[PDB]
Amino acid sequence: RAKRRKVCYFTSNGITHIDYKDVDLLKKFVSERGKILPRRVTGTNAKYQRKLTAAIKRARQMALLPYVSGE
Amino acid sequence: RRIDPSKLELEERLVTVNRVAKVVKGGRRFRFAALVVVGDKNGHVGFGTGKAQEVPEAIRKAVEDAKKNLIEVPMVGTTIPHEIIGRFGAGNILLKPASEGTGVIAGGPVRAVLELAGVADILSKSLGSNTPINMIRATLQGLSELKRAEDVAKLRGKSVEELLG
Amino acid sequence: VMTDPIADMLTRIRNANMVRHEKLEIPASKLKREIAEILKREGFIRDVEFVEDSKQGIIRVFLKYGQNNERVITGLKRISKPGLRVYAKSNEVPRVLNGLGIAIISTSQGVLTDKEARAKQAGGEVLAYVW
RNA sequence: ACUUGAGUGCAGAAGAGGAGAGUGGAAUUCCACGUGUAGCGGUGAAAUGCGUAGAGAUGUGGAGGAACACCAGUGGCGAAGGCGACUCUCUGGUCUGUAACUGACGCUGAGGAGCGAAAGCGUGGGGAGCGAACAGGAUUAGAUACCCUGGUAGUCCACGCCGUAAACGAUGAGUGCUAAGUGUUAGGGGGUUUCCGCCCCUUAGUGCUGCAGCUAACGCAUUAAGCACUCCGCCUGGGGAGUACGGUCGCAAGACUGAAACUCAAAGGAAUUGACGGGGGCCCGCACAAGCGGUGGAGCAUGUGGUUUAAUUCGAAGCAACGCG
């Protein structure tokens, strides 16, 4: 009490990125098997999960992060 | 408030003693139910009753219901102060203020209630429900909401007998 | 919005009339003003003190009803509907309540009361009715 | 005349609001070739079907259509139906904030105009999955169904018509007021805070919990079904019957509008008590399971049914009538 663990994950040191030139926070965002991270277990905000999800897609379109992973 | 004690001569008219049966394993356990209203003949006229096994039992629980509650009904000499359409419970009552020799023209539960509760000329014709309990309910709320002129001058501070006619 | 002002004031004194609030607001207008002097002079509320300022408004009356539930504002009704107007002649100026309440017919010489308007003996638009 | 209403401005914020073009993967099918054998498949159990013409599986590559998993949530947006991969063009709208201007320029609104899921309808494209009608096999007494294996139209696209839905919150729109708490996005002001973060005030939108009040009860409750005002639409017992007849539109399919004669005293909403359940939960008993010994097979004893009689006396007929009175 009274907050979430991993408090907001982007609002402390953001904002407004990335997307294409970023592969670092994109490296810490797209999950281990290959999927996008859950917004309850990762801990982003509303607009934080929206921007990191849109930049996760738009950074997955130019072949930056993998469109599928291993098992 | 205040709860008037049983300290007068009660009239004890019976409104209606309805049948009732709880449909249980074996037919229907029939028990009488009567909502008969007792009246003081001056203004204490209260109307509630219960159930029991015999017809005299329903008389007994009904009389206990009359010793439960009583109402005031302030009305200056064969009238009420303001003839208000008083009904609560989906059953209306339209009781106006009538003249001296215009009689107590009311219905079943109205003629029982006002007929055993000191009425001289109060015209009443209902508009709404027709259950007995609904009639004594909306009639009891209407009789328990009509205002008296002296106290109506004594609580709204304009003047006593300043509103005459 | 703004369907009728007097119905907004009457709904104000009604809804606050059951809320048990100490003071009550209003939209300040000539009907709230003259109706505030009439309905305050007849002894329902404590005092209307029309605290005016830019741009418009704004009246502020206090409920003059004591411990006893339902004081001098015991129930109000729109006797005149702005949209289908009431009317009342001299002999047909009806005194609402019978002996308790009082009606306020907007006479041709000022917003009168019931008995005072019958004292002038001239009716007009039935402005409101406070049962 | 004036400014809060309503509008313009200025600055912010946000979104699967729309239309057009282009692009990207995961997966299924199909095809080509390698590898390999005797099963694959499906079910309650099977069968139809596929497989030694080499299937399934597995490896590689190619083609094509449709939908975009993770983020994703009683989240967002829209008038509603609805809207989801990603990018761009063109475009509408909402809310916040001071507050420059305008000065009531507003609310509703029968007709009229326009949009409206899915099924359909016309033409021309597209047909990978799914899949009415259809074929076969199964289950049943029967299976024009449930199940399985297949399979046409359709779903997809563009152009036009269709204009119905439980089109639902079964709640028309606008405005004002009226206890509180707790979430949740989109903002703003602030208290100290470089941070961050906590907390208050504030909007706007949306969810829960509940005061007053409403109510037939369930319930609603600042997103009211409260309290009042404006305006539109709808309702007058059920069946007959949204049927007939007449009109309007439709390519049709039909849509809108829409009666009547006869007949009945009930339909109906909520709530209660019991019953039921091949609904769930808990439990018990020769109930089942576990063992013993039987009956139904044989001759005989008694009773009943039946048939006969002059009469085969009357009473009992699921356990609870039948070695009963």
XYZ file of C-alpha atoms (C1' of nucleotides) in Angstrom:
692
model
C 0.000 0.000 0.000
C -0.650 2.239 -1.674
C 0.601 1.814 -5.243
C 1.631 -0.795 -7.803
C 4.937 -2.629 -7.815
C 7.059 -1.395 -10.710
C 5.435 2.007 -10.417
C 4.257 3.027 -13.898
C 7.471 1.825 -15.638
C 7.562 4.742 -18.120
C 5.991 7.762 -16.387
C 9.005 8.271 -14.126
C 11.477 8.883 -16.970
C 9.427 9.191 -20.189
C 7.731 10.114 -22.369
C 6.561 10.213 -26.002
C 8.869 7.599 -27.512
C 10.176 5.642 -29.121
C 9.664 4.040 -31.525
C 11.735 2.933 -34.507
C 15.151 4.097 -33.246
C 14.391 2.549 -29.850
C 15.209 -1.129 -29.412
C 16.246 -0.865 -25.762
C 12.993 -0.254 -23.879
C 11.451 -2.241 -26.714
C 13.953 -4.894 -25.634
C 12.615 -4.681 -22.076
C 8.951 -4.623 -23.189
C 8.254 -7.398 -25.739
C 8.013 -10.567 -23.684
C 10.217 -13.636 -23.475
C 8.350 -16.154 -25.637
C 7.621 -13.424 -28.186
C 4.288 -11.887 -27.236
C 3.708 -8.360 -25.985
C 3.882 -8.023 -22.238
C 0.768 -8.063 -20.049
C -0.179 -4.591 -18.865
C -0.829 -5.889 -15.355
C 2.478 -7.753 -14.936
C 4.613 -5.174 -16.753
C 3.040 -2.214 -14.999
C 2.554 0.540 -17.564
C -0.069 3.283 -17.322
C -2.950 3.840 -19.715
C -1.134 6.137 -22.146
C 2.159 4.379 -21.408
C 0.848 0.963 -22.452
C -0.854 2.596 -25.427
C 2.317 4.259 -26.717
C 4.585 1.309 -25.922
C 2.088 -1.025 -27.610
C 1.781 1.117 -30.739
C 5.555 1.566 -30.937
C 5.938 -2.154 -30.207
C 3.811 -2.894 -33.272
C 5.348 -0.178 -35.492
C 8.786 -1.378 -34.389
C 7.737 -4.934 -35.190
C 6.703 -3.912 -38.713
C 10.199 -2.868 -39.871
C 11.641 -6.197 -38.651
C 13.169 -4.719 -35.477
C 11.584 -6.949 -32.851
C 10.655 -10.482 -33.932
C 7.146 -11.217 -35.159
C 7.402 -14.638 -33.492
C 9.853 -16.279 -31.106
C 10.932 -19.713 -29.945
C 9.050 -21.839 -27.431
C -45.667 10.313 17.666
C -46.981 10.238 20.219
C -48.301 6.716 20.709
C -51.732 7.292 22.299
C -52.491 4.758 25.054
C -55.573 2.543 25.052
C -57.445 4.876 27.409
C -60.949 5.241 25.966
C -63.930 3.314 24.637
C -62.954 1.528 21.409
C -65.503 0.858 18.661
C -63.924 -2.277 17.119
C -65.609 -2.460 13.727
C -64.456 -5.317 11.497
C -63.300 -4.279 8.033
C -63.259 -7.731 6.444
C -62.144 -11.170 7.573
C -60.480 -12.674 4.505
C -59.480 -16.284 4.003
C -55.827 -17.270 3.629
C -54.038 -20.553 2.999
C -50.337 -21.393 2.710
C -50.133 -24.084 0.031
C -48.140 -26.703 1.912
C -47.723 -30.469 1.611
C -51.235 -31.748 2.238
C -53.719 -29.285 0.782
C -53.766 -25.734 2.097
C -53.373 -24.831 5.767
C -56.287 -22.391 5.999
C -56.011 -19.521 8.488
C -58.393 -16.591 8.861
C -57.088 -13.062 8.301
C -59.075 -9.988 9.352
C -58.002 -6.335 9.289
C -60.652 -4.838 11.596
C -60.181 -1.260 12.774
C -61.039 -0.008 16.276
C -62.326 3.522 16.794
C -62.405 5.872 19.783
C -65.406 7.931 18.596
C -63.484 11.178 19.030
C -60.438 10.899 16.783
C -58.405 7.923 17.971
C -59.291 5.558 15.093
C -56.602 3.013 14.230
C -56.899 0.146 11.786
C -54.604 -2.857 11.747
C -55.140 -6.571 12.368
C -53.553 -10.003 12.097
C -54.304 -13.678 11.609
C -55.334 -16.617 13.792
C -57.035 -19.997 13.612
C -60.685 -19.123 14.317
C -62.924 -16.187 13.418
C -62.878 -15.070 17.063
C -59.099 -15.537 16.993
C -58.902 -13.031 14.140
C -61.087 -10.780 16.269
C -58.527 -11.142 19.074
C -55.432 -10.414 16.977
C -57.315 -7.577 15.267
C -58.192 -5.984 18.623
C -54.540 -6.349 19.601
C -53.767 -4.483 16.382
C -56.161 -1.711 17.415
C -54.382 -1.474 20.767
C -51.173 -1.179 18.743
C -51.716 2.130 16.953
C -54.004 5.146 16.887
C -54.247 8.320 14.820
C -55.280 11.883 15.573
C -57.353 13.171 12.630
C -57.663 16.858 13.609
C -60.827 18.281 12.066
C -62.890 21.219 13.301
C -66.480 20.033 13.533
C -67.515 17.691 10.699
C -64.651 18.422 8.306
C -60.903 18.274 7.823
C -58.666 21.361 7.525
C -57.576 20.922 3.896
C -59.387 18.345 1.758
C -56.300 16.632 0.340
C -56.248 13.714 -2.106
C -54.581 11.303 0.265
C -53.496 7.869 -0.878
C -50.276 5.946 -0.290
C -49.888 2.381 -1.485
C -51.294 2.516 -5.037
C -54.781 3.206 -3.685
C -55.964 6.802 -3.647
C -58.665 8.506 -1.597
C -60.301 11.818 -2.496
C -61.656 13.230 0.785
C -62.728 16.870 0.570
C -64.126 19.167 3.279
C -67.928 19.072 3.348
C -70.632 21.146 5.014
C -72.480 20.460 8.265
C -75.442 18.349 7.161
C -73.840 16.756 4.112
C -73.259 13.349 5.724
C -70.316 10.933 5.741
C -70.396 9.850 2.086
C -67.526 7.345 1.891
C -67.022 3.808 0.650
C -66.197 0.462 2.213
C -62.948 1.098 4.060
C -63.560 4.839 4.025
C -67.067 4.477 5.461
C -65.756 2.055 8.071
C -62.729 4.196 9.005
C -64.265 7.668 8.948
C -67.618 6.169 9.973
C -66.054 4.875 13.203
C -63.598 7.774 13.605
C -65.767 10.844 14.182
C -66.870 12.242 10.819
C -69.796 14.593 10.251
C -69.591 15.778 6.632
C -66.586 14.658 4.588
C -67.306 13.739 0.973
C -65.100 10.879 -0.193
C -64.942 8.966 -3.471
C -61.824 6.903 -4.120
C -59.625 6.802 -7.210
C -57.313 3.801 -7.358
C -56.870 0.447 -5.639
C -59.598 -1.596 -3.974
C -57.852 -4.012 -1.627
C -58.882 -3.686 2.029
C -55.337 -3.259 3.343
C -54.620 -0.752 0.573
C -57.781 1.163 1.484
C -56.941 1.417 5.182
C -53.330 2.208 4.252
C -53.972 5.128 1.894
C -56.921 6.319 3.982
C -54.789 6.159 7.134
C -51.978 8.107 5.466
C -54.453 10.678 4.167
C -56.131 11.076 7.546
C -52.647 11.141 9.107
C -51.495 13.933 6.778
C -54.379 16.439 6.836
C -53.437 19.632 8.664
C -55.228 21.545 11.436
C -55.730 25.292 11.122
C -54.721 26.413 14.622
C -51.529 24.340 14.613
C -50.992 25.326 10.970
C -50.887 28.919 12.163
C -48.859 27.900 15.220
C -46.039 26.203 13.271
C -45.891 28.401 10.169
C -45.521 31.736 11.869
C -47.930 34.080 10.138
C -50.897 34.412 12.512
C -53.479 32.252 14.298
C -56.918 32.762 12.748
C -55.321 35.069 10.174
C -56.380 32.535 7.534
C -60.161 32.391 8.015
C -63.163 32.358 5.680
C -32.763 24.521 -21.556
C -34.615 27.075 -19.393
C -38.145 25.843 -20.030
C -39.689 27.991 -17.277
C -37.979 30.104 -14.591
C -40.745 29.974 -11.959
C -40.824 26.181 -12.254
C -37.065 26.146 -11.696
C -37.446 28.225 -8.538
C -40.407 26.125 -7.388
C -38.428 22.946 -8.043
C -35.591 24.565 -6.085
C -37.720 25.357 -3.027
C -39.364 21.938 -3.368
C -36.241 19.749 -3.692
C -34.451 21.792 -1.060
C -37.806 21.821 0.739
C -37.393 18.083 1.296
C -33.596 18.064 1.552
C -33.537 19.831 4.957
C -30.959 22.364 3.772
C -30.380 25.627 5.591
C -30.132 28.032 2.655
C -31.323 27.686 -0.924
C -30.093 29.303 -4.141
C -32.177 30.492 -7.096
C -31.912 32.297 -10.440
C -32.343 36.008 -9.678
C -35.182 37.485 -11.734
C -38.208 39.721 -11.259
C -40.342 36.646 -10.586
C -37.844 35.350 -8.045
C -37.654 38.896 -6.652
C -41.362 39.745 -6.327
C -42.158 36.118 -5.506
C -39.400 36.267 -2.892
C -40.976 39.319 -1.265
C -44.462 37.773 -1.420
C -43.485 34.259 -0.328
C -41.124 35.699 2.285
C -43.632 38.247 3.578
C -46.292 35.555 3.995
C -43.927 33.724 6.331
C -42.577 30.571 4.728
C -38.817 31.084 4.569
C -36.643 33.023 7.005
C -35.191 35.713 4.762
C -34.428 36.350 1.108
C -31.352 38.573 0.732
C -30.872 39.075 -3.009
C -27.076 39.222 -3.181
C -26.815 40.696 -6.672
C -23.684 41.046 -8.807
C -22.443 40.641 -12.358
C -23.726 39.294 -14.531
C -27.153 37.962 -13.534
C -28.714 36.763 -10.300
C -28.631 35.490 -7.757
C -31.202 35.092 -4.988
C -30.467 33.160 -1.803
C -33.267 32.244 0.625
C -33.239 30.239 3.858
C -35.776 27.547 4.769
C -37.877 28.870 7.680
C -39.022 25.436 8.809
C -38.138 24.379 12.320
C -37.724 21.048 14.066
C -41.169 19.862 12.966
C -40.778 18.101 9.617
C -42.285 20.255 6.870
C -42.376 23.924 7.871
C -43.985 26.913 6.138
C -42.869 25.435 2.791
C -44.919 22.232 3.117
C -45.599 21.586 -0.584
C -45.611 23.653 -3.771
C -47.282 23.053 -7.120
C -47.119 24.717 -10.513
C -50.677 26.022 -10.704
C -49.776 27.843 -13.906
C -47.982 25.795 -16.558
C -45.744 27.907 -18.806
C -46.850 26.115 -21.937
C -50.574 25.819 -21.131
C -51.428 28.854 -19.052
C -53.898 28.961 -16.172
C -56.376 31.806 -15.865
C -58.636 33.148 -13.135
C -61.228 35.922 -13.253
C -62.291 38.089 -10.314
C -64.949 35.758 -8.886
C -62.981 32.668 -9.976
C -59.679 33.472 -8.211
C -59.327 30.162 -6.328
C -57.775 30.181 -2.852
C -55.602 27.076 -2.705
C -55.641 24.778 0.317
C -59.017 25.847 1.705
C -57.735 27.240 4.996
C -54.077 26.272 5.326
C -52.216 27.106 2.116
C -52.229 30.195 -0.084
C -51.985 30.767 -3.842
C -50.151 33.582 -5.647
C -51.970 34.939 -8.714
C -49.949 37.529 -10.633
C -52.468 40.381 -10.521
C -52.562 43.422 -12.792
C -51.110 45.693 -10.083
C -48.367 43.421 -8.697
C -47.754 39.804 -7.781
C -50.435 39.543 -5.103
C -51.356 36.805 -2.660
C -54.627 34.880 -2.635
C -56.608 36.812 -0.016
C -55.052 40.160 -0.912
C -55.773 39.605 -4.602
C -59.356 38.801 -3.667
C -59.164 42.028 -1.642
C -58.367 43.849 -4.865
C -60.914 41.508 -6.483
C -58.965 41.176 -9.760
C -57.265 38.040 -11.068
C -54.612 37.335 -13.669
C -52.026 34.698 -14.501
C -52.014 32.028 -11.791
C -48.345 32.434 -10.937
C -47.791 29.493 -8.564
C -49.626 27.609 -5.837
C -48.100 26.757 -2.459
C -50.183 24.058 -0.775
C -29.194 46.836 -23.487
C -25.916 42.538 -20.662
C -23.649 37.469 -20.348
C -23.577 32.034 -17.864
C -26.919 29.678 -22.489
C -25.228 28.511 -27.431
C -21.370 29.665 -31.007
C -16.397 31.499 -32.887
C -11.295 32.169 -31.299
C -6.542 30.634 -28.632
C -3.856 26.472 -26.577
C -3.992 21.421 -25.042
C -5.367 16.324 -24.839
C -7.237 11.783 -26.557
C -9.403 7.637 -29.409
C -10.629 0.028 -33.130
C -15.073 7.493 -35.539
C -15.022 7.149 -41.329
C -13.296 6.744 -46.807
C -9.442 5.332 -50.351
C -4.452 3.082 -51.475
C -0.310 0.154 -50.016
C 2.337 -3.440 -46.690
C 3.235 -7.232 -43.056
C 3.416 -11.574 -40.499
C 1.152 -16.343 -37.263
C -2.324 -20.395 -38.792
C -5.421 -23.765 -42.110
C -6.075 -25.756 -47.009
C -3.953 -27.208 -51.680
C 0.400 -28.304 -54.813
C 5.834 -30.042 -55.976
C 9.856 -32.990 -54.038
C 12.702 -35.362 -50.059
C 12.060 -38.930 -45.160
C 9.126 -42.954 -43.631
C 5.227 -47.138 -42.714
C 0.287 -49.107 -41.773
C -2.445 -46.796 -40.013
C -4.703 -41.476 -40.042
C -9.236 -39.651 -38.685
C -13.413 -39.099 -35.696
C -16.686 -40.820 -30.860
C -20.451 -41.319 -25.502
C -19.054 -46.221 -28.349
C -18.522 -46.779 -33.423
C -19.032 -46.229 -38.529
C -18.980 -43.394 -43.160
C -14.321 -40.996 -45.088
C -8.712 -41.032 -46.158
C -4.355 -44.397 -46.535
C 0.620 -49.737 -49.929
C -1.617 -45.027 -56.501
C 2.881 -44.330 -50.021
C -1.498 -41.479 -45.900
C -0.637 -39.270 -40.944
C 3.550 -37.164 -39.085
C 8.232 -34.387 -40.496
C 11.649 -31.176 -43.867
C 11.822 -27.555 -47.719
C 9.609 -24.294 -51.249
C 5.403 -22.080 -53.919
C 0.122 -20.269 -54.733
C -4.382 -18.159 -52.817
C -8.224 -16.414 -49.707
C -10.015 -14.812 -45.132
C -9.100 -12.937 -40.100
C -5.500 -10.285 -37.422
C -3.432 -13.890 -30.905
C -0.245 -11.278 -27.755
C -1.345 -5.677 -25.882
C -7.082 -6.427 -24.524
C -9.730 -4.596 -19.750
C -18.081 -4.406 -16.779
C -10.791 0.208 -21.493
C -11.414 3.943 -25.745
C -14.461 6.323 -30.048
C -19.272 6.873 -32.625
C -26.009 9.382 -33.543
C -26.944 4.030 -33.619
C -25.734 -0.450 -36.238
C -21.079 -0.816 -34.755
C -15.537 -0.185 -35.019
C -9.047 -4.011 -33.777
C -2.381 -6.250 -37.530
C 0.781 -1.779 -39.608
C 1.613 2.858 -42.681
C 0.097 7.073 -45.592
C -3.612 10.692 -48.007
C -8.600 13.116 -47.402
C -12.224 13.996 -43.319
C -15.880 14.436 -39.232
C -16.528 14.731 -34.044
C -15.682 14.887 -28.577
C -13.744 16.727 -23.895
C -10.154 20.286 -20.933
C -8.229 25.195 -20.074
C -7.972 30.232 -19.469
C -10.740 33.110 -21.262
C -10.274 37.574 -27.240
C -15.184 38.149 -29.712
C -20.875 37.455 -30.761
C -25.124 38.692 -27.651
C -30.053 34.155 -26.995
C -28.134 33.258 -32.707
C -31.439 27.841 -28.257
C -34.480 23.009 -27.030
C -37.736 19.532 -29.303
C -39.576 18.602 -33.881
C -45.186 15.295 -36.912
C -44.215 15.030 -42.251
C -39.629 15.292 -45.597
C -34.240 13.781 -46.064
C -30.388 10.348 -44.635
C -27.862 5.960 -42.215
C -28.914 1.224 -40.293
C -26.066 -5.965 -37.973
C -26.959 -10.555 -40.164
C -29.929 -12.994 -43.687
C -31.297 -12.179 -48.350
C -31.758 -9.729 -54.103
C -29.301 -8.129 -59.279
C -24.565 -8.019 -62.014
C -19.432 -8.847 -62.307
C -15.213 -10.443 -59.589
C -13.117 -13.784 -55.256
C -13.492 -18.494 -53.454
C -8.094 -20.847 -48.055
C -11.225 -21.808 -43.592
C -16.258 -21.911 -41.973
C -20.856 -23.671 -43.988
C -28.274 -23.919 -44.693
C -30.098 -27.066 -48.642
C -27.743 -32.139 -50.033
C -24.940 -37.168 -49.555
C -23.240 -41.162 -46.326
C -22.539 -43.385 -41.439
C -24.072 -43.425 -36.464
C -27.842 -42.906 -31.593
C -33.483 -44.166 -31.386
C -39.181 -47.970 -31.874
C -38.907 -43.844 -35.494
C -34.260 -39.566 -36.648
C -36.787 -35.211 -42.851
C -32.882 -33.472 -35.853
C -28.518 -33.597 -31.695
C -23.288 -36.337 -33.074
C -19.298 -37.487 -37.051
C -17.276 -37.621 -42.017
C -18.002 -34.793 -46.419
C -20.575 -30.765 -49.307
C -23.570 -26.188 -52.822
C -25.263 -21.194 -52.018
C -23.322 -17.700 -48.704
C -19.489 -15.425 -45.835
C -15.046 -11.882 -49.036
C -14.863 -7.308 -52.927
C -16.854 -3.321 -55.943
C -21.212 -1.353 -57.780
C -27.110 -0.907 -56.649
C -31.651 -2.631 -54.096
C -33.351 -4.317 -49.737
C -34.626 -0.459 -44.341
C -36.040 -5.838 -40.515
C -33.728 -7.830 -35.014
C -34.251 -9.228 -27.701
C -31.927 -2.569 -33.584
C -31.907 -3.574 -25.338
C -30.219 0.033 -20.700
C -37.007 -3.749 -23.361
C -35.701 3.370 -20.152
C -37.175 9.481 -26.488
C -34.393 14.243 -26.480
C -33.109 18.822 -23.758
C -32.449 21.572 -19.081
C -32.170 22.777 -13.390
C -31.833 20.816 -8.439
C -31.228 16.870 -4.581
C -26.774 12.153 0.923
C -22.459 9.803 0.461
C -18.405 6.227 -0.590
C -15.204 3.315 -3.923
C -13.038 2.305 -8.700
C -11.307 3.931 -14.467
C -9.621 6.327 -18.454
C -9.160 11.629 -21.134
C -7.562 16.521 -19.153
C -6.753 20.895 -15.860
C -5.538 24.045 -11.001
C -2.685 23.286 -6.473
C 0.373 21.569 -1.560
C 5.683 20.902 -0.763
C 8.009 18.306 -4.209
C 14.447 19.384 -10.138
C 12.799 14.388 -9.751
C 9.289 10.850 -8.856
C 5.394 10.004 -5.907
C 1.323 11.170 -2.599
C -3.032 14.289 -1.390
C -6.866 17.959 -2.268
C -9.925 20.867 -5.548
C -11.817 20.468 -10.371
C -14.085 18.957 -15.101
C -15.718 15.379 -18.842
C -16.895 10.109 -19.596
C -17.815 5.482 -17.647
C -18.589 1.235 -13.613
C -19.698 -0.626 -8.760
C -22.094 0.314 -3.328
C -25.893 3.022 -1.365
C -29.446 8.280 1.590
C -33.659 10.895 0.571
C -37.349 10.185 -2.887
C -40.193 6.736 -6.521
C -42.875 1.583 -6.979
C -47.271 -3.260 -7.370
C -42.677 -5.973 -6.020
C -38.028 -6.650 -8.217
C -35.433 -2.639 -8.360
C -33.669 2.847 -9.964
C -31.098 6.239 -7.288
C -26.636 12.876 -9.735
C -25.727 8.086 -16.009
C -33.077 8.116 -11.399
C -37.658 4.897 -13.066
C -36.493 11.139 -7.676
C -38.058 16.222 -7.946
C -40.365 20.115 -11.801
C -40.478 22.483 -16.995
C -40.405 22.036 -23.123
C -41.592 18.820 -27.199
C -42.242 14.392 -30.074
C -43.695 9.216 -30.458
C -46.422 5.195 -28.441
C -50.596 2.528 -25.036
C -56.538 1.493 -24.033
C -58.304 -6.873 -22.296
C -56.803 -11.563 -24.872
C -57.616 -14.595 -29.325
C -59.086 -13.494 -34.006
C -54.513 -10.787 -36.061
C -49.865 -7.702 -37.590
C -54.062 -11.966 -40.590
C -57.534 -10.217 -44.539
C -58.965 -5.843 -48.067
C -57.190 -1.355 -49.952
C -53.058 1.918 -50.990
C -46.929 3.404 -51.063
C -42.109 1.331 -52.043
C -39.481 -3.065 -53.550
C -36.257 -6.786 -59.237
C -37.978 -10.062 -55.859
C -38.169 -11.778 -50.950
C -41.405 -8.744 -48.573
C -41.542 -3.763 -45.653
C -44.819 0.199 -44.018
C -50.034 1.178 -42.973
C -53.591 -1.918 -41.230
C -59.156 -3.535 -39.871
C -63.446 -6.696 -39.002
C -67.406 -10.844 -37.829
C -67.418 -14.361 -34.035
C -65.736 -15.834 -29.224
C -63.926 -15.699 -23.807
C -63.767 -13.841 -18.534
C -59.734 -14.314 -18.398
C -54.898 -13.363 -20.433
C -50.598 -10.555 -17.917
C -46.357 -8.329 -14.215
C -44.048 -9.111 -9.514
C -43.937 -11.905 -5.006
C -45.049 -16.172 -1.644
C -45.914 -21.435 -0.308
C -45.260 -26.217 -1.729
C -44.104 -29.837 -5.910
C -40.878 -31.179 -9.789
C -35.841 -31.724 -12.187
C -32.840 -37.087 -15.995
C -30.160 -29.010 -11.783
C -26.188 -28.555 -8.364
C -24.614 -29.324 -2.864
C -24.700 -32.308 2.003
C -26.254 -36.856 4.318
C -28.738 -41.540 5.680
C -30.949 -46.673 5.350
C -29.844 -54.442 2.995
C -30.530 -48.972 -0.947
C -26.151 -49.982 -4.213
C -21.488 -52.208 -3.888
C -19.141 -57.046 -1.034
C -20.761 -62.282 0.239
C -24.498 -66.015 1.579
C -28.924 -68.564 0.275
C -32.977 -68.324 -2.767
C -37.260 -67.437 -6.366
C -38.407 -67.688 -11.878
C -36.936 -74.665 -14.011
C -39.470 -79.997 -11.384
C -43.770 -82.613 -8.250
C -46.813 -80.801 -4.344
C -49.597 -77.088 -0.462
C -52.555 -72.550 -0.255
C -54.672 -67.815 -2.485
C -55.784 -64.758 -6.895
C -56.908 -64.075 -12.125
C -59.566 -66.289 -15.660
C -63.161 -70.437 -17.890
C -67.341 -73.387 -16.024
C -71.576 -73.649 -12.874
C -77.955 -74.164 -10.631
C -74.117 -71.862 -7.240
C -68.736 -71.942 -7.783
C -71.012 -66.559 -1.182
C -68.899 -61.546 0.114
C -64.382 -58.354 1.096
C -59.167 -57.078 -0.397
C -56.218 -55.466 -6.554
C -48.653 -51.236 -6.712
C -45.174 -51.795 -2.520
C -49.796 -51.386 1.228
C -54.271 -57.761 -3.444
C -52.597 -62.774 -3.598
C -50.058 -69.298 3.035
C -55.275 -61.912 2.954
C -60.393 -61.641 6.584
